Amino acid sequence: SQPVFASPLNVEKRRLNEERALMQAQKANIQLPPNYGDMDLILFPEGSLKNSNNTVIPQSHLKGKSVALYFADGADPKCASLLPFLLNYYRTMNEGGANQKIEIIFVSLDRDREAFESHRAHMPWLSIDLENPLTEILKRHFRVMKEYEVPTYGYGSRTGVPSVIVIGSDGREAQFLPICSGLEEGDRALLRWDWRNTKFA
Amino acid sequence: SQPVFASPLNVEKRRLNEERALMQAQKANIQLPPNYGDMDLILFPEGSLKNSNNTVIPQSHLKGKSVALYFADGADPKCASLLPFLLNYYRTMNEGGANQKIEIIFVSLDRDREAFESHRAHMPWLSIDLENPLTEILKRHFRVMKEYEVPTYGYGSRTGVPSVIVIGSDGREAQFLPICSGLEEGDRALLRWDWRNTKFA
Amino acid sequence: SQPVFASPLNVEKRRLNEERALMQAQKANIQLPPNYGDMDLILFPEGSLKNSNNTVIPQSHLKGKSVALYFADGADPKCASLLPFLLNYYRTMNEGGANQKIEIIFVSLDRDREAFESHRAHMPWLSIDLENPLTEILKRHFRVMKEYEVPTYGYGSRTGVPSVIVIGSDGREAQFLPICSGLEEGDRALLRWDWRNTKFA
Amino acid sequence: MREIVHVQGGQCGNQIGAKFWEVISDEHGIDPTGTYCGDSDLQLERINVFYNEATGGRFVPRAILMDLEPGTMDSVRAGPFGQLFRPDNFVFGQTGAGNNWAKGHYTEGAELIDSVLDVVRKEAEGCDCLQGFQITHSLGGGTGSGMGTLLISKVREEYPDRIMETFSVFPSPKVSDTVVEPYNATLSVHQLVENADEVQVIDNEALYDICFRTLKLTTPTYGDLNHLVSAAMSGVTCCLRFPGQLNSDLRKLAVNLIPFPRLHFFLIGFAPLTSRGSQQYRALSVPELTQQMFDAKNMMCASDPRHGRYLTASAMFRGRMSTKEVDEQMLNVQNKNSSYFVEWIPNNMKSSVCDIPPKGLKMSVTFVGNSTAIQEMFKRVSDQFTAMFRRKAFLHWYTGEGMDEMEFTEAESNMNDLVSEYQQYQ
Amino acid sequence: MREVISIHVGQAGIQIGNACWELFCLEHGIQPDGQMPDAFNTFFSETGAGKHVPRCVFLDLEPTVVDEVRTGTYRHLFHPEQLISGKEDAANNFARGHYTIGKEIVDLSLDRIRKLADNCTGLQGFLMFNAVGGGTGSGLGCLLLERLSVDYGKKSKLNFCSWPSPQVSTAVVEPYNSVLSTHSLLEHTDVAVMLDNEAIYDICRRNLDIERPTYTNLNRLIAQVISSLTASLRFDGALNVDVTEFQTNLVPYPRIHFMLSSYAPIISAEKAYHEQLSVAEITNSAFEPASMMAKCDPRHGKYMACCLMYRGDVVPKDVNAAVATIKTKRTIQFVDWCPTGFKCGINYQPPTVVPGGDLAKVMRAVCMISNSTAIAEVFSRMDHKFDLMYAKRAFVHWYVGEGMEEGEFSEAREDLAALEKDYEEVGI
Amino acid sequence: PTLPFNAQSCYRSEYVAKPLPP
Amino acid sequence: PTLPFNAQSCYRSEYVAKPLPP
């Protein structure tokens, strides 16, 4: 139940964990429905992610790295402007050090296949395929939306596009870097990344 | 994560090494993901390198020699100019001792099989076959390109064909030979080679 | 790397020896890459040399002797002129003493098997068959070319056919005999052959 | 940071100034529509110097179009890169100055000035901190020369310490269309010797000599001529927009090239320059640039510098190059031609290096020389002025608008003393 | 505990500051970040968990050369306020950089300086790097030294002046800047070392045989001088030399504090594996006039005093056996009232090579600093080039109209003339 | 019809995040 | 079609690095 209640990934999490809690309770003083603390979540299913060679990596590979979601649309001037700084920031922070510190997932807001391919070819970080239901699910979960056509359940929009949100293992958000937000400090928002206190454990 | 973070050998290296790190972690406060120091890769597979008779030698043959890649094109005038000086340097430098000093691998930016074999007939050092994807992977690893055709990820061209790259065990760019570079010592830059400190260990 | 570095036979030598060295180092201040003095090859395998009336002669029978390769052609008028002088020289020199001292191994630059058998029917010394890739790797090793057709790695054509080259244990040329060379002493360069020093151990 | 306000005057200034925005936009990767393509930092790091965000992704130039007739800026709007300009930055006129400097300056300039100067007040002050202005105009025309210069007079009083450079195209030597040329030129110079800071003179006949003798163009149109003038404009402001090994702003150039405050009329060349036929055959290097540069054939004025003395020069280099090669060539030039450099100053030249070249060339140079060979420019206007002022030819036009005959005599003396000033250092 | 504060002012100071701090960080083994993952204390601070922040200030009146520092690799290493910037330049103008534009940037300078110098006392002094030929390098350079002199009296104020070359200047207003600075560099600076530009250019073109150096190859060689300068301050030494040590040893009288430089050996990788760099060999090359870093032949002067800093596997014995040879050589000579004229230094840690540079990894080195009478020509040459210009009032309208008064040139002329009278009187 | 831009500066070519001192 | 150049200098023919005597 972070960061919203009314999200598809939260109802998925509640479903599986309710199911597993019922099963182990039937085998056995179990709090039904389970506590959100007791809930355990698989965020990216086994074959959602892929690197720049379009081969799948498991979710467990992301251990020890600050993983940031990057909601981007191709045709958007603003995302086209943000991309070089982000490349440079990835460059510098992951080249100058002892361990890999940060990692980026790309989530498309484009409309079709060739647009997605053309946009993703510029990006070395991991990406989620367009047709996958996880893209829509994540959009609803973080309430990222280009313009309001999606029925949000009484909430609003946390952000527009582009956005970078660093995430944790459990599917929360640890920091929402203000590119085009309440603070509107674009391309200087990158410098506020606390990769020390945000780890994908 | 040398010389770049976003290169195909480094992404295969990262995947493979931490795959093995999770395996031994499951089998057992070993640091995940493993340090660039802790990582090991096999650069040239079993069947990559071949000599003058097209008979395959393994990678472990290169141990104790200053090895250097040579990115060459068959029809390029600059490559046509640089080839005799490189060949004479190879001749004299390796002849003038009771020990092997340096070795050249041939990486082909050439058009097709016929032209590749015709050009490879002129070289007395080792080569990698053109149809082998390792050629393209090495090109994107070392950021050599004939013009901006394959995407590079916020990086630049390190150089153009022709180029000689002194390499290390782990894909370390040991030194750049300034043939067509920031310095432009055409046919003179070969004398810069410090074979003493750059050993394929 | 004697007398050339870009030889196929020298590349084969480096392969075998350095493979042996790596396996020995894996098993156990052992020098990688191995010293040229420490490198050893098998030059003529058991099925290379055939004597008069076609019987297989191993390498073992070449020991403690002065051995010269005769790079010869069938239809070359200079070869036809050189042959009787060398025949008389071989006969007289071997009769003149207790020991047989010199030996000739014949390397053919003929077109085909008919020419090979027709020319080799004269000769009483040892001959290497035309199909065996030895007859070309030795040719490339000692830099013999009738016509500039071999892909030749910035070599000079060291000799033209006919030629005789005194070979050492480790493939080094003991001495060049100047028939068509710097001295240009045809059919009398035979007398310059010293046999005290140039012993095949 | 620093911004340059661009001000374009007359038919010439619009057609010249269109291409200046075409080359800067191409240099900074700007679409005709207004957006940006090319994902590199180098462009947008210093974009404030010329451009202005609109928060639709898009940029507007810091440009003030200015003309007294509606026709000439209809053409620049209908063209490509014509949607780039904000349509309020245009200022229209209905009447128009018919090559009459008086009614450009006094009568039909005085009612449009309150409008165009309002646009300048809004736009120049609108940044954090202004660096200066640049004006492009003809001194042969009416609204480029009469009303263009009155803008300079008023903006200079309001903003005393800001730089103020111009790209003025003078009267031609040989052929003289718009027959009232020396009246426009002479009356402009004395207003442009007092109220202007740096002046870079261009002759049309010098440009046509370059085309026909070197570039070997069959039909050199105003597109091709204006391409070259724009490449000179971009050269003198590389430092403002890209980094380098030795930085050089506009004020840095002036304090070197101007030894005494009266004399600030400069000459411009540009190297390299070869035809498309001989593009691939010509070896490009620093010595090859510096000997193309020091040539009357290459210069953009019809005044042979070997008739005089380079009082002070400068070269603004662009490209990946060694300082020592720059240092030798600027010394080699002074060692061999010792008679073409004034003697009571050693090392008459300044060097500047900007890293980013113009797109397509790996190395280039623009050139600025302060010479006493530009004396032969003003004399050839001075005799032409007194030739038709003797007869009082076409004076009723000028004197019917508001001037007195006294202003003509002052413009004579204020130009002849400048002639006499270049004598004093020769 | 033990500190020395670096001050970089101007174009030249910043660029040579960049190459200095790259080598200092590299040889102390600290990352771009600043965490090596107490020999460093002289240059760097301790800011929490193993994080080191340099003790330097960058000053410039224009932002475009300090932008590129805040933008490149070492942007996480320098404290953001330790790079101070204005919005407009001084434009090769002393007058602008002193009176007009300079007044509102020195207040920020002295705040950062005071906070970076009050953490521990026993501060050795301030290294200063300025371009004399420049605007903010000269103009502002006097002014922050003026206020420093009022505040911290007792304490060394060294300077590394990038001086105009005899033949190549690339600035025509530069004789005015150089003379005006030298007057005020005389009063409130303890030691001045001259690094002529084209002195180092031809050193590279002969020794290293480099056709195409840039400023960065020049900056690396100056960086090797400062490292060999302060090696005894940071590291263990057989006979260490500090910075207070210099002023007593190389300055006979108040007015005379203008010294030259020569570093040897500098040879490329292609002719270093041939050379046995013995102490005798490297000290012979130090005294050669073709290796001096000012383009000023000491054959028309006398060595008033001289300082030598050895670095590497250098024994004290071979120094004495090699300096005695220099005393007996007849081409080099000493003033009569200086029978003994040497200060020696031996430091253990050999010079550090920067990868992708153009020097070679070598066993031992010499840095030599000398006070000479040959300095008479370098101001006697400006003597000519100033009276040429000022006779007919070239460029004088710029200086007058922006705050200066007429007669500051006459005061600068008299002090420079008295300085030439002073060097000629010493040499008798 | 605009070709893309293939220049990188003196700065980016040589001031890179260097590996650790030996 | 072509016939190739074949000649090299007397210096490179007979001045090469010979292996040292025992």
PDB file of N, CA, C and O in Angstrom, chain D residues 37-80:
ATOM      1  N   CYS D  37      17.401  19.575 -32.248  1.00  0.00           N
ATOM      2  CA  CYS D  37      17.851  18.223 -32.511  1.00  0.00           C
ATOM      3  C   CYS D  37      19.364  18.150 -32.377  1.00  0.00           C
ATOM      4  O   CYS D  37      20.060  19.041 -32.863  1.00  0.00           O
ATOM      5  N   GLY D  38      19.814  17.083 -31.706  1.00  0.00           N
ATOM      6  CA  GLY D  38      21.210  16.699 -31.746  1.00  0.00           C
ATOM      7  C   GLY D  38      21.872  16.349 -30.411  1.00  0.00           C
ATOM      8  O   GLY D  38      23.080  16.204 -30.417  1.00  0.00           O
ATOM      9  N   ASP D  39      21.127  16.180 -29.308  1.00  0.00           N
ATOM     10  CA  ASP D  39      21.552  15.626 -28.013  1.00  0.00           C
ATOM     11  C   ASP D  39      23.042  15.754 -27.631  1.00  0.00           C
ATOM     12  O   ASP D  39      23.695  14.786 -27.227  1.00  0.00           O
ATOM     13  N   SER D  40      23.567  16.982 -27.680  1.00  0.00           N
ATOM     14  CA  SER D  40      24.902  17.309 -27.203  1.00  0.00           C
ATOM     15  C   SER D  40      24.810  18.570 -26.364  1.00  0.00           C
ATOM     16  O   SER D  40      23.997  19.459 -26.635  1.00  0.00           O
ATOM     17  N   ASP D  41      25.668  18.606 -25.356  1.00  0.00           N
ATOM     18  CA  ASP D  41      25.642  19.644 -24.352  1.00  0.00           C
ATOM     19  C   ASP D  41      26.123  20.976 -24.933  1.00  0.00           C
ATOM     20  O   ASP D  41      25.540  22.012 -24.620  1.00  0.00           O
ATOM     21  N   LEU D  42      27.158  20.912 -25.780  1.00  0.00           N
ATOM     22  CA  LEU D  42      27.952  22.009 -26.335  1.00  0.00           C
ATOM     23  C   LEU D  42      27.092  23.129 -26.910  1.00  0.00           C
ATOM     24  O   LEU D  42      27.520  24.282 -26.983  1.00  0.00           O
ATOM     25  N   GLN D  43      25.933  22.761 -27.462  1.00  0.00           N
ATOM     26  CA  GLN D  43      25.089  23.762 -28.089  1.00  0.00           C
ATOM     27  C   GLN D  43      24.395  24.564 -26.991  1.00  0.00           C
ATOM     28  O   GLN D  43      24.559  25.773 -26.914  1.00  0.00           O
ATOM     29  N   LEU D  44      23.682  23.865 -26.101  1.00  0.00           N
ATOM     30  CA  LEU D  44      22.730  24.471 -25.185  1.00  0.00           C
ATOM     31  C   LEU D  44      23.399  25.026 -23.926  1.00  0.00           C
ATOM     32  O   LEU D  44      22.744  25.687 -23.124  1.00  0.00           O
ATOM     33  N   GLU D  45      24.698  24.760 -23.749  1.00  0.00           N
ATOM     34  CA  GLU D  45      25.412  25.228 -22.566  1.00  0.00           C
ATOM     35  C   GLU D  45      25.514  26.750 -22.555  1.00  0.00           C
ATOM     36  O   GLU D  45      25.445  27.383 -21.504  1.00  0.00           O
ATOM     37  N   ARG D  46      25.711  27.312 -23.743  1.00  0.00           N
ATOM     38  CA  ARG D  46      25.707  28.750 -23.904  1.00  0.00           C
ATOM     39  C   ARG D  46      24.791  29.079 -25.073  1.00  0.00           C
ATOM     40  O   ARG D  46      25.276  29.285 -26.180  1.00  0.00           O
ATOM     41  N   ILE D  47      23.485  29.113 -24.785  1.00  0.00           N
ATOM     42  CA  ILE D  47      22.459  29.336 -25.787  1.00  0.00           C
ATOM     43  C   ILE D  47      21.766  30.651 -25.488  1.00  0.00           C
ATOM     44  O   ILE D  47      21.137  31.205 -26.373  1.00  0.00           O
ATOM     45  N   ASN D  48      21.937  31.132 -24.249  1.00  0.00           N
ATOM     46  CA  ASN D  48      21.368  32.354 -23.708  1.00  0.00           C
ATOM     47  C   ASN D  48      21.918  33.577 -24.466  1.00  0.00           C
ATOM     48  O   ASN D  48      21.334  34.663 -24.419  1.00  0.00           O
ATOM     49  N   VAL D  49      23.058  33.414 -25.147  1.00  0.00           N
ATOM     50  CA  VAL D  49      23.756  34.511 -25.805  1.00  0.00           C
ATOM     51  C   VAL D  49      22.917  35.035 -26.969  1.00  0.00           C
ATOM     52  O   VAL D  49      22.914  36.236 -27.280  1.00  0.00           O
ATOM     53  N   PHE D  50      22.195  34.109 -27.602  1.00  0.00           N
ATOM     54  CA  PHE D  50      21.395  34.474 -28.754  1.00  0.00           C
ATOM     55  C   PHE D  50      19.907  34.178 -28.569  1.00  0.00           C
ATOM     56  O   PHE D  50      19.069  34.971 -29.009  1.00  0.00           O
ATOM     57  N   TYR D  51      19.575  33.050 -27.927  1.00  0.00           N
ATOM     58  CA  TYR D  51      18.211  32.531 -27.965  1.00  0.00           C
ATOM     59  C   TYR D  51      17.449  32.729 -26.656  1.00  0.00           C
ATOM     60  O   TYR D  51      18.049  33.182 -25.656  1.00  0.00           O
ATOM     61  N   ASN D  52      16.140  32.364 -26.702  1.00  0.00           N
ATOM     62  CA  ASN D  52      15.214  32.665 -25.624  1.00  0.00           C
ATOM     63  C   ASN D  52      14.100  31.624 -25.565  1.00  0.00           C
ATOM     64  O   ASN D  52      13.395  31.401 -26.533  1.00  0.00           O
ATOM     65  N   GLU D  53      13.882  30.992 -24.419  1.00  0.00           N
ATOM     66  CA  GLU D  53      12.890  29.924 -24.361  1.00  0.00           C
ATOM     67  C   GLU D  53      11.472  30.482 -24.401  1.00  0.00           C
ATOM     68  O   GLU D  53      11.199  31.578 -23.942  1.00  0.00           O
ATOM     69  N   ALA D  54      10.567  29.665 -24.915  1.00  0.00           N
ATOM     70  CA  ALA D  54       9.171  30.012 -25.104  1.00  0.00           C
ATOM     71  C   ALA D  54       8.270  29.068 -24.302  1.00  0.00           C
ATOM     72  O   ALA D  54       7.049  29.212 -24.326  1.00  0.00           O
ATOM     73  N   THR D  55       8.871  28.100 -23.589  1.00  0.00           N
ATOM     74  CA  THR D  55       8.151  27.043 -22.873  1.00  0.00           C
ATOM     75  C   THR D  55       7.098  26.329 -23.729  1.00  0.00           C
ATOM     76  O   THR D  55       6.019  26.004 -23.258  1.00  0.00           O
ATOM     77  N   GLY D  56       7.408  26.105 -25.001  1.00  0.00           N
ATOM     78  CA  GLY D  56       6.783  25.090 -25.847  1.00  0.00           C
ATOM     79  C   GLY D  56       7.845  24.187 -26.470  1.00  0.00           C
ATOM     80  O   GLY D  56       7.667  23.591 -27.534  1.00  0.00           O
ATOM     81  N   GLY D  57       8.978  24.139 -25.767  1.00  0.00           N
ATOM     82  CA  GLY D  57      10.214  23.539 -26.221  1.00  0.00           C
ATOM     83  C   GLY D  57      11.140  24.515 -26.963  1.00  0.00           C
ATOM     84  O   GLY D  57      12.316  24.236 -27.154  1.00  0.00           O
ATOM     85  N   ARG D  58      10.588  25.602 -27.495  1.00  0.00           N
ATOM     86  CA  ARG D  58      11.117  26.245 -28.676  1.00  0.00           C
ATOM     87  C   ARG D  58      11.829  27.535 -28.289  1.00  0.00           C
ATOM     88  O   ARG D  58      11.660  28.072 -27.213  1.00  0.00           O
ATOM     89  N   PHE D  59      12.627  28.055 -29.210  1.00  0.00           N
ATOM     90  CA  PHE D  59      13.485  29.201 -28.970  1.00  0.00           C
ATOM     91  C   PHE D  59      13.092  30.343 -29.896  1.00  0.00           C
ATOM     92  O   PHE D  59      12.797  30.123 -31.057  1.00  0.00           O
ATOM     93  N   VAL D  60      13.205  31.560 -29.384  1.00  0.00           N
ATOM     94  CA  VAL D  60      13.106  32.755 -30.196  1.00  0.00           C
ATOM     95  C   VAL D  60      14.460  33.454 -30.180  1.00  0.00           C
ATOM     96  O   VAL D  60      15.136  33.519 -29.157  1.00  0.00           O
ATOM     97  N   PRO D  61      14.930  33.964 -31.336  1.00  0.00           N
ATOM     98  CA  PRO D  61      16.138  34.788 -31.339  1.00  0.00           C
ATOM     99  C   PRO D  61      15.940  36.131 -30.642  1.00  0.00           C
ATOM    100  O   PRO D  61      14.825  36.634 -30.530  1.00  0.00           O
ATOM    101  N   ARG D  62      17.055  36.707 -30.181  1.00  0.00           N
ATOM    102  CA  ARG D  62      17.053  38.019 -29.544  1.00  0.00           C
ATOM    103  C   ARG D  62      17.126  39.128 -30.596  1.00  0.00           C
ATOM    104  O   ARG D  62      17.928  40.062 -30.492  1.00  0.00           O
ATOM    105  N   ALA D  63      16.270  39.023 -31.619  1.00  0.00           N
ATOM    106  CA  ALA D  63      16.419  39.823 -32.824  1.00  0.00           C
ATOM    107  C   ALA D  63      15.344  40.894 -32.892  1.00  0.00           C
ATOM    108  O   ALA D  63      14.200  40.643 -32.541  1.00  0.00           O
ATOM    109  N   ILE D  64      15.731  42.064 -33.398  1.00  0.00           N
ATOM    110  CA  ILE D  64      14.805  43.154 -33.633  1.00  0.00           C
ATOM    111  C   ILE D  64      14.860  43.502 -35.114  1.00  0.00           C
ATOM    112  O   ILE D  64      15.775  44.205 -35.546  1.00  0.00           O
ATOM    113  N   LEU D  65      13.873  42.997 -35.876  1.00  0.00           N
ATOM    114  CA  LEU D  65      13.700  43.372 -37.274  1.00  0.00           C
ATOM    115  C   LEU D  65      13.287  44.830 -37.321  1.00  0.00           C
ATOM    116  O   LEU D  65      12.552  45.292 -36.446  1.00  0.00           O
ATOM    117  N   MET D  66      13.713  45.526 -38.377  1.00  0.00           N
ATOM    118  CA  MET D  66      13.444  46.948 -38.423  1.00  0.00           C
ATOM    119  C   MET D  66      13.579  47.439 -39.859  1.00  0.00           C
ATOM    120  O   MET D  66      14.655  47.331 -40.471  1.00  0.00           O
ATOM    121  N   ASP D  67      12.464  48.005 -40.334  1.00  0.00           N
ATOM    122  CA  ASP D  67      12.419  48.569 -41.669  1.00  0.00           C
ATOM    123  C   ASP D  67      11.229  49.517 -41.769  1.00  0.00           C
ATOM    124  O   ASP D  67      10.242  49.396 -41.012  1.00  0.00           O
ATOM    125  N   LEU D  68      11.339  50.466 -42.715  1.00  0.00           N
ATOM    126  CA  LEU D  68      10.317  51.486 -42.906  1.00  0.00           C
ATOM    127  C   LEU D  68       9.282  51.119 -43.986  1.00  0.00           C
ATOM    128  O   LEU D  68       8.399  51.932 -44.250  1.00  0.00           O
ATOM    129  N   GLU D  69       9.391  49.950 -44.640  1.00  0.00           N
ATOM    130  CA  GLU D  69       8.404  49.550 -45.635  1.00  0.00           C
ATOM    131  C   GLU D  69       8.023  48.090 -45.417  1.00  0.00           C
ATOM    132  O   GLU D  69       8.882  47.284 -45.073  1.00  0.00           O
ATOM    133  N   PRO D  70       6.755  47.679 -45.655  1.00  0.00           N
ATOM    134  CA  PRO D  70       6.307  46.363 -45.209  1.00  0.00           C
ATOM    135  C   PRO D  70       6.748  45.198 -46.096  1.00  0.00           C
ATOM    136  O   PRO D  70       6.552  44.058 -45.724  1.00  0.00           O
ATOM    137  N   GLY D  71       7.334  45.484 -47.259  1.00  0.00           N
ATOM    138  CA  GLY D  71       7.573  44.456 -48.258  1.00  0.00           C
ATOM    139  C   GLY D  71       8.715  43.511 -47.890  1.00  0.00           C
ATOM    140  O   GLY D  71       8.570  42.289 -48.032  1.00  0.00           O
ATOM    141  N   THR D  72       9.829  44.074 -47.381  1.00  0.00           N
ATOM    142  CA  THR D  72      11.104  43.348 -47.329  1.00  0.00           C
ATOM    143  C   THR D  72      11.094  42.303 -46.224  1.00  0.00           C
ATOM    144  O   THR D  72      11.882  41.372 -46.271  1.00  0.00           O
ATOM    145  N   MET D  73      10.269  42.532 -45.210  1.00  0.00           N
ATOM    146  CA  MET D  73      10.163  41.586 -44.103  1.00  0.00           C
ATOM    147  C   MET D  73       8.945  40.671 -44.256  1.00  0.00           C
ATOM    148  O   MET D  73       8.686  39.818 -43.409  1.00  0.00           O
ATOM    149  N   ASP D  74       8.172  40.852 -45.321  1.00  0.00           N
ATOM    150  CA  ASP D  74       7.213  39.839 -45.735  1.00  0.00           C
ATOM    151  C   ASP D  74       7.964  38.664 -46.356  1.00  0.00           C
ATOM    152  O   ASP D  74       7.591  37.506 -46.141  1.00  0.00           O
ATOM    153  N   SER D  75       9.048  38.977 -47.076  1.00  0.00           N
ATOM    154  CA  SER D  75       9.834  37.936 -47.753  1.00  0.00           C
ATOM    155  C   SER D  75      10.587  37.049 -46.767  1.00  0.00           C
ATOM    156  O   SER D  75      10.682  35.835 -46.961  1.00  0.00           O
ATOM    157  N   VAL D  76      11.092  37.683 -45.703  1.00  0.00           N
ATOM    158  CA  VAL D  76      11.848  36.934 -44.713  1.00  0.00           C
ATOM    159  C   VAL D  76      10.921  36.070 -43.843  1.00  0.00           C
ATOM    160  O   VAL D  76      11.368  35.116 -43.206  1.00  0.00           O
ATOM    161  N   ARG D  77       9.633  36.428 -43.758  1.00  0.00           N
ATOM    162  CA  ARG D  77       8.677  35.650 -42.969  1.00  0.00           C
ATOM    163  C   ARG D  77       8.214  34.425 -43.765  1.00  0.00           C
ATOM    164  O   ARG D  77       8.039  33.341 -43.200  1.00  0.00           O
ATOM    165  N   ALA D  78       8.027  34.608 -45.078  1.00  0.00           N
ATOM    166  CA  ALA D  78       7.515  33.546 -45.936  1.00  0.00           C
ATOM    167  C   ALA D  78       8.566  32.466 -46.192  1.00  0.00           C
ATOM    168  O   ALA D  78       8.210  31.355 -46.582  1.00  0.00           O
ATOM    169  N   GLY D  79       9.849  32.781 -45.948  1.00  0.00           N
ATOM    170  CA  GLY D  79      10.921  31.840 -46.240  1.00  0.00           C
ATOM    171  C   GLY D  79      11.063  30.754 -45.160  1.00  0.00           C
ATOM    172  O   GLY D  79      10.397  30.808 -44.132  1.00  0.00           O
ATOM    173  N   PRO D  80      11.943  29.733 -45.305  1.00  0.00           N
ATOM    174  CA  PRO D  80      12.243  28.840 -44.187  1.00  0.00           C
ATOM    175  C   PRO D  80      13.129  29.578 -43.185  1.00  0.00           C
ATOM    176  O   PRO D  80      13.760  30.592 -43.498  1.00  0.00           O
TER     177      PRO D  80
END
